[PDB]
Design an enzyme around this catalytic site. Sequence first.
Site, PDB file in Angstrom:
ATOM      1  N   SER A  68     -10.021  -0.800   6.774  1.00 41.98           N
ATOM      2  CA  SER A  68      -9.444  -0.641   5.443  1.00 41.98           C
ATOM      3  C   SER A  68      -8.824  -1.919   4.890  1.00 41.98           C
ATOM      4  O   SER A  68      -8.351  -1.902   3.749  1.00 41.98           O
ATOM      5  CB  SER A  68      -8.403   0.475   5.458  1.00 41.98           C
ATOM      6  N   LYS A 105       0.834  -1.192   0.000  1.00 39.91           N
ATOM      7  CA  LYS A 105       0.000   0.000   0.000  1.00 39.91           C
ATOM      8  C   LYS A 105       0.875   1.250   0.000  1.00 39.91           C
ATOM      9  O   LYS A 105       2.010   1.242   0.486  1.00 39.91           O
ATOM     10  CB  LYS A 105      -0.930  -0.001   1.212  1.00 39.91           C
ATOM     11  N   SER A 123      -9.752   1.595   2.768  1.00 40.26           N
ATOM     12  CA  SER A 123      -9.037   2.532   1.913  1.00 40.26           C
ATOM     13  C   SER A 123      -8.024   1.817   1.013  1.00 40.26           C
ATOM     14  O   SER A 123      -7.406   2.441   0.146  1.00 40.26           O
ATOM     15  CB  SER A 123      -8.339   3.598   2.757  1.00 40.26           C
TER      16      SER A 123
HETATM   17  P1  GJY Z   1      -9.137   2.780   7.128  1.00 35.28           P
HETATM   18  O1  GJY Z   1      -8.699   1.897   8.336  1.00 35.28           O
HETATM   19  C1  GJY Z   1     -10.746   3.613   6.775  1.00 35.28           C
HETATM   20  C2  GJY Z   1     -11.409   4.146   8.043  1.00 35.28           C
HETATM   21  C3  GJY Z   1     -12.127   5.473   7.815  1.00 35.28           C
HETATM   22  C4  GJY Z   1     -11.185   6.672   7.898  1.00 35.28           C
HETATM   23  C5  GJY Z   1     -11.809   7.953   7.350  1.00 35.28           C
HETATM   24  C6  GJY Z   1     -13.204   8.217   7.909  1.00 35.28           C
HETATM   25  C7  GJY Z   1     -13.419   9.678   8.294  1.00 35.28           C
HETATM   26  C8  GJY Z   1     -14.896  10.071   8.319  1.00 35.28           C
HETATM   27  C9  GJY Z   1     -15.178  11.417   7.648  1.00 35.28           C
HETATM   28  C10 GJY Z   1     -15.720  12.399   8.340  1.00 35.28           C
HETATM   29  C11 GJY Z   1     -16.067  12.193   9.813  1.00 35.28           C
HETATM   30  C12 GJY Z   1     -17.257  11.260  10.027  1.00 35.28           C
HETATM   31  C13 GJY Z   1     -18.033  11.424  11.076  1.00 35.28           C
HETATM   32  C14 GJY Z   1     -17.739  12.546  12.069  1.00 35.28           C
HETATM   33  C15 GJY Z   1     -18.998  13.074  12.752  1.00 35.28           C
HETATM   34  C16 GJY Z   1     -19.761  13.955  12.141  1.00 35.28           C
HETATM   35  C17 GJY Z   1     -19.383  14.449  10.747  1.00 35.28           C
HETATM   36  C18 GJY Z   1     -20.574  14.511   9.794  1.00 35.28           C
HETATM   37  O2  GJY Z   1      -7.999   3.829   6.804  1.00 35.28           O
HETATM   38  C19 GJY Z   1      -6.635   3.647   7.244  1.00 35.28           C
END
Ligand code: GJY
Lengths: 602, 605
Positions: B305, B205, B281
Amino acid sequence: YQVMKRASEVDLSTVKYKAETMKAPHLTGLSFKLFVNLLEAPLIGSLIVDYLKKDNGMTKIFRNTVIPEEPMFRPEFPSQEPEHDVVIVGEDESPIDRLETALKCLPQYDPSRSLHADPVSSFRYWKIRDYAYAYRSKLTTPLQVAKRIISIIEEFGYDKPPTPFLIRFDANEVIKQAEASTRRFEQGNPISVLDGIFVTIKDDIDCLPHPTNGGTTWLHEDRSVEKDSAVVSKLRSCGAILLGKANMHELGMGTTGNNSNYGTTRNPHDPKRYTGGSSSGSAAIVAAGLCSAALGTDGGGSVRIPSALCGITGLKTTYGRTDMTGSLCEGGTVEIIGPLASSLEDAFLVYAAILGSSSADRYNLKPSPPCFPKLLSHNGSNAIGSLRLGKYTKWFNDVSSSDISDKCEDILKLLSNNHGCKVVEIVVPELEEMRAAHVISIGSPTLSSLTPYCEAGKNSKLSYDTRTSFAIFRSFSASDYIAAQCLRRRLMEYHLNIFKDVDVIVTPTTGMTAPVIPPDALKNGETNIQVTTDLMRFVLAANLLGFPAISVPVGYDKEGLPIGLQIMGRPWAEATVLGLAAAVEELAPVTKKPAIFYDILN
Amino acid sequence: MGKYQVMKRASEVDLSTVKYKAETMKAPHLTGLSFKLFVNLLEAPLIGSLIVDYLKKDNGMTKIFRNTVIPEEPMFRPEFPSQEPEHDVVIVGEDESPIDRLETALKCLPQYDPSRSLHADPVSSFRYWKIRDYAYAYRSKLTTPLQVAKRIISIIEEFGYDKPPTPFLIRFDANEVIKQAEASTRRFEQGNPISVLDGIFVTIKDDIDCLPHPTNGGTTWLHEDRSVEKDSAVVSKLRSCGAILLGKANMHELGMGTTGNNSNYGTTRNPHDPKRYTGGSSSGSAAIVAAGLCSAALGTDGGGSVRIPSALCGITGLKTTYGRTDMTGSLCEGGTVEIIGPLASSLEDAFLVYAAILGSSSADRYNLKPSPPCFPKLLSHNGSNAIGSLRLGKYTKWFNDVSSSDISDKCEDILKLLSNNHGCKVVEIVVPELEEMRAAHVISIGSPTLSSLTPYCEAGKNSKLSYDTRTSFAIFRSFSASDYIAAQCLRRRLMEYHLNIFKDVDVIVTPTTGMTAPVIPPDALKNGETNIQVTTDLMRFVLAANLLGFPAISVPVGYDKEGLPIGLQIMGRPWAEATVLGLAAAVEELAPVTKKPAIFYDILN
Ligand SMILES: *[P@](=O)(CCCCCCCC/C=C\C/C=C\C/C=C\CC)OC
Ligand SMILES: *[P@](=O)(CCCCCCCC/C=C\C/C=C\C/C=C\CC)OC
């Protein structure tokens, strides 16, 4: 654009002593009230706080510096080498048993220092064993002592404004405990040496039946005390007499003792001067001699700072050494429960009674078994002489008074000639990072603990001193806390490499003597981050990293104010720090009687 | 009750009182130009904070972090007590070389059958090539790693899998792959192969350091400020076994997404259905393995991910215990939820790559004190083995809360198949405080990521990020320091809940995702998209293993109506990878992968 770092690869001969004092306005009275409202104001509030952070180099450290270290959230100690010439005691034994082992480490009590003596001798406080010997020799009773103490509290109004020692005092409960204690001395079965000894609990530690306000006027409405705390239940099982809850700086957000809701406690050596925060009442009631010892907290120096300014002994245990269950600062990462006593002998006894890690920290921190220093030994100075005293000269002399840097220097020369100690020169890198990493590590848990209370409408009932600090703490983001924990690892790797060369790190406790109280601040508090920070310029090391430290009197300055010396040793090495501190009191004993003093045993 | 301030209690709740709180995530779905203006509004001074605080107030996060007293002390990093030793496993030292553990893991595998590679009936079903199939062909001289490299490079150039719009790799050098395959081919001719992984192709990755390619993390500028100089811990171990590093995989930018949308290099398409997402991801790592190009790949898992794309693409992804695998040399080191996990086409391949990359760091060895690694005896070692004496925990309300009736039943078929063919007990359990787990996770993953890149963004590089990342960063800057303290107080509550669950059951079985492969809206291919509703709905099952550190795995268990893969998650006790790998191995026996995806490439011919 950005600054790069790397911790475990710096040259110690390259680190330069960066001495940046804090820069903040000094406001009192009405201007303080309007300044608090400007900070709590929507748009303009965020601008004033971000200005203060960028002006003091905090934004440059948290946001404009890449740190290659991984975050160390809680103090992580390696397996230390066993300290020499100590007595190992069980960590889960009853406090009554540990008080007997500790009684064997103390020198033999001589009765010629309590009952019969020459009426042309010097001045000294009453030791705990002085009360214990008088109770057992039928010279006095804990009941008659309680009456004399309550007589002084009501005669001088030390339980009510404007200048109180206690903010939660009940005479009927003091007599109730002293009666049961007295009848145990008559029946001939005292619990321990602490049976009949009067101790004062800080207002942020739970102690029945009094509630826990933490210096506020509303905390008892949302946080009701259920049972005794871990440190008070141990003290209560030894037969101690809880005198009451002590005055403190509101929620521990300050190092002066200013409380605009109950009054500002006055220094027993000079009533027109501060006591030191946050354990203001605990230090003053002990310095005045009303009680023998007192329990306080120390998440940023609230045990050692008021001890150096009042001329008493304050013990800051290792992070996790003393169980904090039942206090306002449990769950933190810098706070502990430490005793404040008049002499080293009294503080050692209380430490033996209250120590004992919690069931949770026992499995996470894995502490070494407790050790009691052999304070008496006719054999040669086995451990005292073979100690390396680390000293940062450029850091040692950076004080706002030439008296305290030399009076501590006199003790070092006295230690080397009368025992053979080696004074080794050391260097403490990244001193400005340790201050910035600490202020966020202490404020974030405190702000989070009271956040549901403030958003429910109780934020207006806080003093202007606390609201100013909480306004700055709300500026710290979650990303700022992560970067601070990565700094805590750097300061940890430095001090660990220092403790391989030296055994302790000696410094003066504070950078100034007892400061004067401005008369305008007595009406609603004051914001003086410059002086508040200047008092912590030596004690932030033990809190952020968890090392055990102590404050001991080493003499007095020009105007007769006490001078404090700090001794910070290896993790879990309280016995090493206690034994060395016992020799310091032997070379420079407390001799000046304070202005506000009361003799009880007579 | 929720009137003035809310009050809690942890180790004293009645599990019969806890009621299931279902899906609640509400957020706008903006694409294209409306997305660009919304980002400018979020990054705007005054109005930017009101929009974020509204989204935090609307989704109930502010009431959790600010209006609730929590009587727990903060647990910053996953703390596990002493675990019961897992039964019927092979113990291997944590100090041995990766080559030595590979020979031990080869003993745990069943006996290889040459009748599944060279000679077979031309009317059989479909099956991915195992790692041992490559190792057999290399040693029997049926083919060489150089010929295999020329075949893979031929496909990447012919279909533009290293170029936009639909790339598998964002950093691919054909000259380097042949250089590594030439040295691997000689060792088979000279007769001294390094191990079983010698000649196997694996994909790294983009957020893991792997020479000579730089580390961008899906961005286009991170190499300008963070230059790599040595291989990471997981890559250096694989390279010492003779593996061939194919290249850096495509990924969602900085792991701030669970869909694989990257508006800078393109959006990798699912091999089962190119019009659908791959799952994030690790979008490129999972697509290149499911397509049959390489045997395995390395990805990260801080919020699913590894498991999320593995379920959506029909492959197996192993989420190891926190601290089990060294994370030195990556963009997620020093976190509290992330790990390095393998993504393979079969359980046999993932077990081998796990044996080669495992090994706690010198710092995590002291603080976490992990048990020695254990390999499951994948063969029928006993007869009525420990597979039957396992208690499977299941939350029926949580199990069925899925946006597709097919994935709730296809996973229920495996449980009934496991009980009848082995004897497993399906114990009903309850997972209290599910909304607190989602809140405490997003802040525990977002804060260290934002803190890692804060000096870069304030130096002017914040504009060079995609709108998807800046949307999340605008939310992450709202998390105060007091909010992070309370979140770690919630991590201890979820810990004491799950530890008491493991006192009754051995593992917890749930579907990996609450939906199959979602469709990519053609507007999101312009400049990304904000879709926090779907981004969160894909993580509704995989957050328990990240915030707490428990090992999990995602295994294919069949397909739905439109032929999309369905994934089943098995989360076990700490350090019990052998328990999770063993149970997952029996699942692949009862429901093997049989449907060939649309995009697929046979390598061995
Ligand atoms: P992986 O292990 C993927 C895991 C997700 C990471 C990114 C998610 C972020 C979320 C985006 C915004 C925040 C979401 C909720 C917050 C609360 C309110 C906002 C509307 O990657 C390594
Ligand atoms: P003790 O252990 C007393 C220790 C002092 C803690 C309180 C200090 C808070 C300082 C107030 C505001 C922040 C100061 C500087 C921040 C940076 C810029 C603002 C000027 O109590 C238990």
